[PDB]
Design a protein around this ligand. Structure first.
Ligand code: FAD
Ligand code: NAP
Ligand code: FMN
Length: 603
C-alpha cells in the first residue's frame, strides 16, 4: 500500500532505482537502469524518493535477492535535490539498522563545483554506516566533460557485478552485426584515416583533430646520455598547414599500434586479418553507425582504430567469458567482474597491476579464442597522445618540437610492454609521417616581457619551458626589455638524464635564463628536489611574486611533483605574508584566476 517494499511484492520486483533529479537527467537514468533489470532474470521499477518513505528500506531483506540503486544529482552547496531532501534529512537524523540491504549509488555532478557529488558520496557512505552492503563501487558522474559516458561506463560494469554477486545470468547480445565484402573499390576502403575518406592521401586544409595533418619527422634524437632510459627530441614539420601554435600548447598525435603486436593476434586467434569488412549498428536509428571508420580490414582496425594495449575493463573480460573452451578459465574471466572479494583482488592483481594487455590475456588463457569481429567491438578506441611543445612559434614556426620519454618496462606479467605513442615515435626515421594536430591552451607567457617568469619543471617537464626560454631569448635579441626569467629543473644525475644541457647552459650564458637552478636527485647521498631549491630561494622568490608581479609555471607529473611544489609556495606566501595556511592558499587561488600561476601537469 505505502511501504515501497510491499508495492514490489505485488508487482514481482526485486530491484528499485531511486532518481534524485531536479532537471531530468537522474530519472532518465534511474529508469534506463531498471529497464535493463529485465535482461538479467530480474525486473525493477524506478521510483522517486519524495513519495514512499525510505525508512522502509529495512523491509528490503524480505524480497529475495533484492537491491536498491540510487541516482542522486547534486545541487548548490552539496544540497540534495528537492525530492531527495526528505530522504536526506532522514539519512542524518536516523539510526535505523539497514542490515542485509544491498545497494549501490551513482551520483551526478560537475567537477567545476566545490562540493562535487557531495550527495552521491554521502547517500553512499551513509548507508554503509547504517549497515548496508555496497554491491558496486560509487559512481562519480561528471557532467562538466561527459556524463553519458561515466554512466554508460558505470552501468557497463555494474550489471556483470550484480550477476557475479546475486547469481543472475546474461545472454551475449552483440551491438554490431558483421558484413564482409567481396569487391569494394580499394579507394573506398578505410586504411588508417581518421575522418575524411582519404584525407591521409590528399591532405586538404583546415587541419585539426577531425582531420589531422601528417607532419614529417625532420630530426629525431636521443636527448639523454644515460642508458637506462630513452628521452628523445622530435621535430615535426608543419610547413603548409597554416597550423599556428604558441609556446605552451599541446600537440596530439595519432599512433599506430605495434605491427608485431597486431599481427601476433590474428595468429593465436586463427583469423584472416585482411578481410575488408564492416560493423553495422543493430540500431539503424542512431549516429554510431560503426565502432571505427568502415569499411576496413581488421588489420587496419587493430592498428589505427583499436586499443589492444591498455588492460581490458572487467566487463570486456566478462563478455569474452564465453569464448573460453575450458570450464576453469571461463570461471575466472567471469569473476574479474566481481564487485569485491578475491575475484576483484585477482583482477587488480592479475590484470591491472601485472599489466596484461589483450594479447597477453589470449596467451595466458589459451582455451579462450573469441571470433575476431566480436572482439573488435568489445575493445575501446585507440586514443591520441598529447605532448607539450618544446618549440617557440616565434622561432621555427614550422617545426613543432616534442620532448618525451619512451615507455618500455619489464611488466609483472613476464613480457616487456612498450608504449604505443612513444615506441611508434621512436622508430620514425628522419618520408616518415606523424598524424597530428594542436590543442590550443591557456599556457602562455606574459604579454609584457618585463614581467618576471618562474618556471618549475623537472624531467620531461622541462618541455614547455624550452619553448618559453626561446621566445624570451628572442624578445631580448629583438630590442624589447625582458624581466627576470628563473628556471627550476631536476633529474637523477648529470651524466645520466640532464636534458638539454648545452641548449640550456647556453641560454644562461647569454641572458635568456637569469638563473638555472638544477636539482639533481641522485648525485649525492640523499635526494634533492626542485621544491627544496624554491624553499632556499623563498627569499628572492617572494619579492618576484609579490612586488615583481611574476607569473609561475609548474609542469611535469601531476602525482607528487605538482603537489609538493605548490605546497612550498603556500609555505612561502605564508611566511612572507604573513598569513595562516588558508590565507596563503587563497593568495595562490586568486593567482590562478589571474593567470600568474598555471599548471601543465600530467600523469
Ligand atoms: C596534456 C598532456 C601532456 C603530455 N606531455 C608529455 C610530454 O611532454 N612528454 C612525455 O613523455 N609524455 C607526455 N604525456 C604522457 C604521454 O602522452 C604518454 O603517456 C607517454 O608517451 C607513454 O606512451 P603512450 O603514449 O604510448 O603510452 P602507453 O603505451 O599507453 O602507456 C602509458 C601507461 O604505461 C604504464 N606504465 C608506464 N611505466 C610503467 C611501469 N614502470 N610499470 C607499469 N606500467 C607502466 C601506465 O599504466 C601508463 O598509464 C602527456 C599527457 C597529457 C595528458
Ligand atoms: N611508485 C613509484 O616508484 C614512482 C615514483 C615517482 C614517479 N613514478 C612514475 O614515473 C613518472 C615520472 O615521470 P618521468 O619519468 O618523466 O620523470 P623523471 O624524468 O624520471 O623524473 C623527474 C624528476 O622528478 C623527481 N621526483 C620524483 N618524485 C618527486 C616528488 N614527490 N617531488 C619532487 N620531485 C620528484 C625525480 O626523482 P627520482 O627519479 O629520484 O624519484 C626526477 O629528478 C610518474 O608519472 C609516475 O607515475 C613512480
Ligand atoms: C545551480 C546548480 C548547482 C549545481 N551544483 C553542483 C554541485 O555543487 N556539485 C556537483 O557535483 N554538481 C553540481 N551541479 C551539476 C548537476 O548535479 C548535474 O548537471 C546533474 O546532471 C543534474 O541532474 P538532474 O538533471 O538529474 O537533476 C549543479 C547544477 C546547477 C544547475
Amino acid at each position: 500500500e505505502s511501504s515501497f517494499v510491499e508495492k514490489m511484492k505485488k508487482t514481482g520486483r526485486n530491484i528499485i532505482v531511486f532518481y534524485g533529479s531536479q532537471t531530468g537527467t537522474a530519472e532518465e537514468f534511474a529508469n534506463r537502469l531498471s529497464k535493463d533489470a529485465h535482461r538479467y532474470g530480474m525486473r525493477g521499477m524506478s521510483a522517486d524518493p519524495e513519495e514512499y518513505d525510505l525508512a522502509d528500506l529495512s523491509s528490503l531483506p524480505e524480497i529475495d535477492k533484492s537491491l536498491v540503486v540510487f541516482c542522486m544529482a547534486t545541487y548548490g552547496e552539496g544540497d540534495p535535490t528537492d525530492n531527495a531532501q526528505d530522504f536526506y534529512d532522514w539519512l542524518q537524523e536516523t539510526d535505523v539498522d539497514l542490515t542485509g540491504v544491498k545497494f549501490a549509488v551513482f551520483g551526478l555532478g560537475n567537477k567545476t563545483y566545490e562540493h562535487f557529488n557531495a550527495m552521491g558520496k554521502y547517500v553512499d557512505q551513509r548507508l554503509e554506516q547504517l549497515g548496508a552492503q555496497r554491491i558496486f563501487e560509487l559512481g562519480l558522474g561528471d557532467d562538466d566533460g561527459n556524463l553519458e559516458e561515466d554512466f554508460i561506463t558505470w552501468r557497463e560494469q555494474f550489471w556483470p557485478a550484480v550477476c557475479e554477486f546475486f547469481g543472475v545470468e546474461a545472454s551475449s547480445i552483440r551491438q554490431y552485426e558483421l558484413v564482409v565484402h567481396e569487391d569494394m573499390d580499394v579507394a573506398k576502403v578505410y586504411t588508417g584515416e581518421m575522418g575524411r575518406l582519404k584525407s591521409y592521401e590528399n591532405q586538404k586544409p583546415p587541419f585539426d583533430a577531425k582531420n589531422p595533418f601528417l607532419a614529417a619527422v625532420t630530426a629525431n634524437r636521443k636527448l639523454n646520455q644515460g642508458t637506462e632510459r630513452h628521452l628523445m627530441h622530435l621535430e615535426l614539420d608543419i610547413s603548409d598547414s597554416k597550423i599556428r601554435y604558441e609556446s605552451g600548447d599541446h600537440v596530439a598525435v595519432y599512433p599506430a599500434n605495434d605491427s608485431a603486436l597486431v599481427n601476433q593476434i590474428g595468429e593465436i586467434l586463427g583469423a584472416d586479418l585482411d578481410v575488408i569488412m564492416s560493423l553495422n549498428n543493430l540500431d539503424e536509428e542512431s549516429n554510431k553507425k560503426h565502432p571505427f571508420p568502415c569499411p576496413t580490414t581488421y588489420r587496419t582496425a587493430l592498428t589505427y582504430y583499436l586499443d589492444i594495449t591498455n588492460p581490458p575493463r572487467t566487463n570486456v573480460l566478462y563478455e569474452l567469458a564465453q569464448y573460453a573452451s575450458e570450464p576453469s578459465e571461463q570461471e575466472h574471466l567471469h569473476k574479474m567482474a566481481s564487485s569485491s572479494g578475491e575475484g576483484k583482488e585477482l583482477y587488480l592483481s592479475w590484470v591491472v597491476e601485472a599489466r596484461r594487455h589483450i594479447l597477453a590475456i589470449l596467451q595466458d588463457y589459451p582455451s579462450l579464442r573469441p571470433p575476431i569481429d566480436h572482439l573488435c567491438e568489445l575493445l575501446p578506441r585507440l586514443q591520441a597522445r598529447y605532448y607539450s611543445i618544446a618549440s617557440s612559434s616565434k622561432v621555427h614556426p614550422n617545426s613543432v618540437h616534442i620532448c618525451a620519454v619512451a615507455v618500455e618496462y619489464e611488466a609483472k606479467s613476464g613480457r616487456v610492454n612498450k608504449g604505443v605513442a612513444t615506441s611508434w615515435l621512436r622508430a620514425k626515421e628522419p618520408r616518415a609521417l606523424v598524424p597530428m594536430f594542436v590543442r590550443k591552451s591557456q599556457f602562455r607567457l606574459p604579454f609584457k616581457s618585463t614581467t618576471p617568469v618562474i618556471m618549475v619543471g623537472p624531467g620531461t617537464g622541462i618541455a614547455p619551458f624550452m619553448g618559453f626560454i626561446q621566445e624570451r631569448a628572442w624578445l631580448r635579441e629583438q630590442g624589447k626589455e625582458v624581466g627576470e626569467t628563473l628556471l627550476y629543473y631536476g633529474c637523477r644525475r648529470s651524466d645520466e638524464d640532464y636534458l638539454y644541457r648545452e641548449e640550456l647552459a647556453r641560454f644562461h650564458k647569454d641572458g635568456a635564463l637569469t638563473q638555472l637552478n638544477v636539482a639533481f636527485s641522485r648525485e649525492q647521498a640523499h635526494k634533492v628536489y626542485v621544491q627544496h631549491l624554491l624553499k632556499r630561494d623563498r627569499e628572492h622568490l617572494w619579492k618576484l611574486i609579490h612586488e615583481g608581479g611574476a607569473h609561475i609555471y609548474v609542469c611535469g607529473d601531476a602525482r607528487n611533483m605538482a603537489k609538493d611544489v605548490q605546497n612550498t609556495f603556500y609555505d612561502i606566501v605564508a611566511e612572507f605574508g604573513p598569513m595562516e595556511h588558508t590565507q596563503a592558499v587563497d593568495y595562490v587561488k586568486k593567482l590562478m584566476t589571474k593567470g600568474r600561476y598555471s599548471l601543465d601537469v600530467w600523469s
